[PDB]
Amino acid sequence: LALSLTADQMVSALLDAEPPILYSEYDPTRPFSEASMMGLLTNLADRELVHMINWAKRVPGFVDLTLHDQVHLLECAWLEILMIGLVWRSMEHPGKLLFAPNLLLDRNQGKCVEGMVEIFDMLLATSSRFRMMNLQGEEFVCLKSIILLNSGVYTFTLKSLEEKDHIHRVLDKITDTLIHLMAKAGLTLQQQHQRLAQLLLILSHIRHMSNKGMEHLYSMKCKNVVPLSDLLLEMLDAHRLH
């Protein structure tokens, strides 16, 4: 039961659930093209999605939901979750995005893909913000779990509203957990609420970046730039863009 976990047990569960950092299929023997760079990012996302599904099952409260609700939340949040992870990995690489250990790109390399540099700039800005706030790994895993449970929650007969209330109780425990972390870190009461707000407002920016990335991915699909896996096609389709 999620609701019975202590704050320290919630943090432990989340840290233990973390997925591995995967490698891209980057081939240094050849120059990038728009198509080959997009191929690398979509190939990586595809492999990362499988690990994400297994991570989600370990987020306390998530396995209590019906499969339909699990599907909906991941469909809503997948790109936000990948992006927050990218931003987190890139924190100690000013000016670059560590898509993978063998795929660390700057904005100039992002220009290889039409319309991608704008999204790169937003990701780099968010990474900078994380660095400037000294975001901690324990706070990061809390935020990533908040994205999973929150992003699709208001798109959810009355065992329905029990699902919704359940989700909100879990989200309340994650808030409690963030505050505990900050308190334990030595922050004053006022500093705790101020930092909680700063962290949660970044989720607004992550949502925005996800929406822009999903529009971009859809344009890449609609221009036959790269073949998307059946999984990525379904995840993209859930967002039903034009």
Partner: peptide, 11 residues
Amino acid sequence: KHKILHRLLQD
């Protein structure tokens, strides 16, 4: 018309 994600959520 079974979603891939729905199946993966079971494996």
